[PDB]
Amino acid sequence: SCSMPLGMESKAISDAQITASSYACRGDTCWSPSKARLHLQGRSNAWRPQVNNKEWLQVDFQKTMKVTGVTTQGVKSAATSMYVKEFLISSSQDGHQWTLFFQNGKVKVFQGNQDSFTPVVNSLDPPLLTRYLRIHPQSWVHQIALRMEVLGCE
């Protein structure tokens, strides 16, 4: 029913297809957008932006895709849970202009995670046909950290 991971977890989506406003590094490990993949493990296994600055993560499908859902997840840095609790969705055909996902005129706030480990699936109703998807963290616990998956087909 058009509900398959689009490749965040399986790396069917490449690391250049995933970009962000910014990301953080230490030594040789970077909380790059390329690490924002569901259930990813390792040193810096999530996207984390440089603490400052409007923050968002972006996925370029390189093709118009039907997106019916987004799965979000936090991460633990040491024993510190970091996750996005609330977020917005915007869509884009070129990657420069962005249209927010409006609920009846008003941008919809998506209820995100309540912990750092459990994935939470948010269904997009109706689905989106986009080449680009962006997630805009609105509120978070401790800090902004994201692993995610996109659900759809095509």
Swiss-Prot record:
Documented effect of changing W56C: In HEMA; moderate
Effect of R37L: In HEMA; moderate
Consequence when changing F87C: In HEMA; severe sporadic
UniProt effect for mutating R131L: In HEMA; mild
Disulphide-bridged cysteine pairs: C2-C153
Domain F5/8 type C, chain residue ranges per copy: 2-153
Outcome after substituting V59A: In HEMA; mild
Effect upon mutating S1I: In HEMA; mild
Name by which UniProt lists this protein: Factor VIIIa light chain
Lineage: Eukaryota, Metazoa, Chordata, Craniata, Vertebrata
Recorded name of the encoding gene: F8
